[PDB]
Design an enzyme around this catalytic site. Structure first.
Site, short mmCIF file in Angstrom:
data_model
loop_
_atom_site.label_atom_id
_atom_site.label_comp_id
_atom_site.label_asym_id
_atom_site.label_seq_id
_atom_site.Cartn_x
_atom_site.Cartn_y
_atom_site.Cartn_z
N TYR A 15 -40.58 149.46 142.18
CA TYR A 15 -40.19 149.16 140.71
C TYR A 15 -41.14 147.77 140.04
O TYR A 15 -42.53 147.98 140.00
CB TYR A 15 -38.64 148.45 141.21
N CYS A 16 -41.00 146.75 139.59
CA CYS A 16 -41.22 145.92 139.07
C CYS A 16 -42.54 146.52 138.68
O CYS A 16 -43.80 145.93 137.25
CB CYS A 16 -41.99 144.87 140.09
N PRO A 17 -42.83 148.04 139.04
CA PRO A 17 -42.33 148.33 140.39
C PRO A 17 -42.15 147.27 141.52
O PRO A 17 -42.77 146.60 141.79
CB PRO A 17 -42.34 149.77 140.53
N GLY A 44 -42.02 150.48 137.46
CA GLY A 44 -41.37 148.53 137.42
C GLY A 44 -42.48 148.26 137.96
O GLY A 44 -42.48 146.78 136.42
N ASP A 48 -44.16 144.23 136.29
CA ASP A 48 -43.75 143.40 136.98
C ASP A 48 -45.41 143.28 137.37
O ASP A 48 -46.15 142.09 137.29
CB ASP A 48 -43.32 143.28 138.08
#
Length: 78
Positions: A15-17, A44, A48
């Site tokens: 996420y952010c990833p 993600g 991020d």
């Protein structure tokens, strides 16, 4: 950033990833004035990823691609 940084940073589905931290954890791996390249797939870290370095302490690099595995780069600036 240094986009020319040489490091190991890749997060698949982090996420952010999930790799969003791979950067913050990278800054500790590299050093100020340095750079590190990360990657991911979750898609993600792309958002991020550019946040990890923000805290990591490395130069803000630019590297985002959602074709298989994303990643980010940071120029250690701690």
């Amino acid at each position: 950033m240094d986009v020319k940084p040489d490091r190991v940073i890749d997060a698949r589905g982090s996420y952010c990833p999930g790799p969003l931290m791979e950067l913050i954890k990278a800054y500790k791996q590299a050093k100020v004035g340095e750079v590190i390249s990360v990657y991911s797939t979750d898609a993600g870290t792309k958002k991020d990823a550019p946040a990890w370095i923000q805290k990591s302490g490395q130069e803000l690099v630019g590297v985002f691609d959602r074709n298989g595995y994303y990643e980010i780069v940071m120029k250690k600036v701690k």
